[PDB]
């Protein structure tokens, strides 16, 4: 039993036939990543059953913009001049590729932050990573290799 | 105002110590190639001994914002220039372990533990603490050295 | 005694293939860590966001040709909690006793 | 000369080659074939030879034992990113 | 390398085909 854990591959060619070309892309990701767990899909199934500061920075163009309204509706803790979301998954993109996050937004007149996971998506692959996790990486690697070097100082 | 102040508070601090460990290694690497002559066993310990020291400060610099950075966990979005030539992005944003993780298992399995859970594990902790307390005994003996 | 301890401290050896292969080991096994400390210098370009950041960035010639300031993060102080509070984290501290033990064996 | 082998013939020949320890080694320490689950899945499919009437065709009995080992190992074997089988990295 | 590669049939052993197998075996029941 071996895990792929801290993001690895895609799901590829299988919704390449179903076709990836933005907007549909997000749903293709859902099958692929094995990472739609609650809200976005839940919204999907219920129907299937029968701005923000970052959003202002983002600005949504086409049908995914319509979905966005739906998602807010699904997940909005409400305060006087503010709304906060539970488990929505969403995206930011360009041309060949994009990046998407699954997040929680806290709002106010002069500031608003979404805490989430962010995932980049190029050519049927997802990236989800952490600095500090990122460092431990080639850092411990550098040192194990330096200690190979130090072990080689077994020279007279 | 369009885009965001993402992260990287102590990132500068990591970079500095990331560099010094790079800088001390790199220089040893350059010499390492003139295997025509090794620099004087004094010289190499001066460079490889402060080169290891460099990674202690670089080791610790990681923990000091250690709550902050694994929490920050930024994955890249960029110019699509990053998308051409591809891999560089996979490579440059990737955390792993090398063939390294393996002697990490050799070591983990070298301990006396693995799947026996919580109650027996908490006990082992108290026992290791007792070993550290028997290590205080070193304090007593050091007084004798006097 | 001092002369002989100084002899052992002269690196000195007359080895053919024996002496040869060993020093090649140093070259490659040291070089690896040198090169991986360069991934460490690439996290430097990863800052971007500042002029002093660009300075650190030019560290790669490929950064010299990969203009962007590229990356961004959010908040999982919760995930910091998970790193620290997990039963996995308690357990991982056992990997600390384990490697340390084998280090003591060495 | 004989015509090209049948699938049944190809698989019988192949399962039996696993009776050779060196060859099984040369595979275990391949790269590509462990990237994708295909080969792993193939070897489990080949356990069809372990029962009658199939097994009655096996001349090299060790290959069945080695297949079984090889198989059980794989389930818990950790696959490195390149293809390297993790639990074997120390050996040649 | 006088050591042969695994049989060409290996390419068919994808996890997608494995999932489709149980239903296929059924339908079949109805070189």
């Amino acid at each position: 039993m071996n895990v792929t854990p801290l993001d690895e591959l895609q799901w590829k060619s299988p919704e390449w036939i179903q076709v990836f070309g933005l907007r549909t892309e997000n749903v293709l990701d859902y099958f692929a990543e094995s990472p739609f767990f609650d809200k976005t899909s839940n919204n999907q199934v219920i129907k299937m059953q029968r701005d923000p500061a970052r959003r202002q920075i983002l600005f949504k163009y086409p049908m995914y913009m319509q979905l966005e309204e739906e998602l807010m509706k699904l997940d909005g803790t409400e305060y006087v001049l503010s709304s906060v979301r539970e488990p929505d998954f969403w995206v930011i993109r360009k041309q060949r590729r994009t990046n998407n996050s699954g997040v929680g937004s806290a709002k106010g007149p002069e500031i608003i932050p979404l805490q989430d996971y962010y995932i980049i998506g190029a050519n049927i692959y997802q990236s989800p990573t952490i600095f500090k996790i990122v460092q431990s990486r080639l850092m411990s690697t550098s040192y194990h290799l330096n200690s190979t070097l130090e072990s080689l100082y077994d020279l007279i | 105002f369009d885009f965001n102040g993402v992260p990287g508070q102590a990132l500068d601090a990591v970079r500095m110590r990331l560099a010094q460990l790079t800088h001390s290694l790199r220089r040893i690497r350059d010499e390492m190639s003139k295997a025509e002559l090794p620099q004087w066993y004094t010289l190499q310990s001066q460079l490889n001994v402060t080169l290891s020291q460099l990674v202690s400060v670089t080791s610790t610099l990681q923990h000091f914002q250690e709550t902050l950075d694994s929490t920050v966990v930024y994955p890249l979005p960029k110019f699509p220039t990053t998308s051409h030539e591809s891999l560089v992005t996979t490579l440059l944003r990737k955390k792993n372990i090398p063939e390294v993780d393996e002697w990490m298992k050799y070591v983990r399995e070298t301990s006396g533990v693995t799947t026996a859970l919580l109650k027996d594990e908490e006990i082992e902790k108290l026992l290791q603490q007792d070993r550290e307390i028997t290590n205080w005994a070193r304090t007593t003996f050091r007084n004798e050295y006097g | 005694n001092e002369n002989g301890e100084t002899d052992d401290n002269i690196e000195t050896v007359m080895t053919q293939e024996q002496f040869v292969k060993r020093r090649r080991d140093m070259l490659e096994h040291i070089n690896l860590a040198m090169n991986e400390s360069s991934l460490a210098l690439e996290f430097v370009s990863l800052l971007l966001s500042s002029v002093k950041e660009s300075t650190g960035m030019s560290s790669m010639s490929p950064f010299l040709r990969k203009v962007v300031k590229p990356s961004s993060l959010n908040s999982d102080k919760i995930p910091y909690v998970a790193p620290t509070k997990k039963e996995y984290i308690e357990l991982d501290i056992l990997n600390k006793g384990w490697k340390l033990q084998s280090l003591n064996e060495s | 000369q004989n015509p090209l082998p049948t699938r049944f013939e190809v698989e019988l020949e192949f399962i039996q080659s696993l009776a050779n320890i060196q060859y099984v080694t040369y595979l275990l320490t391949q790269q590509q074939i462990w990237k994708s689950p295909n080969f792993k899945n193939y070897l489990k499919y080949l356990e069809y030879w372990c029962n009658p009437p199939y097994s009655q065709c096996i001349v090299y009995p060790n290959c069945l034992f080695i297949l079984k080992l090889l198989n059980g190992f794989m389930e818990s074997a950790i696959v490195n990113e390149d293809g390297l089988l993790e639990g074997l990295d120390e050996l040649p | 390398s006088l050591y042969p590669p695994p049989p060409p049939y290996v390419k068919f052993f994808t996890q997608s085909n494995l999932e489709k197998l149980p239903k296929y075996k059924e339908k079949k029941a109805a070189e």
Partner: peptide
């Protein structure tokens, strides 16, 4: 001013950091 310029080495031919297991549909 740590040294002068910054030491290139950039590498995609290294051991490897990616695995692979979700290839199947």
């Amino acid at each position: 001013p740590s040294y002068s310029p910054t030491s290139p080495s950039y590498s995609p031919t290294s051991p490897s950091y990616s695995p692979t297991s979700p290839s199947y549909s």
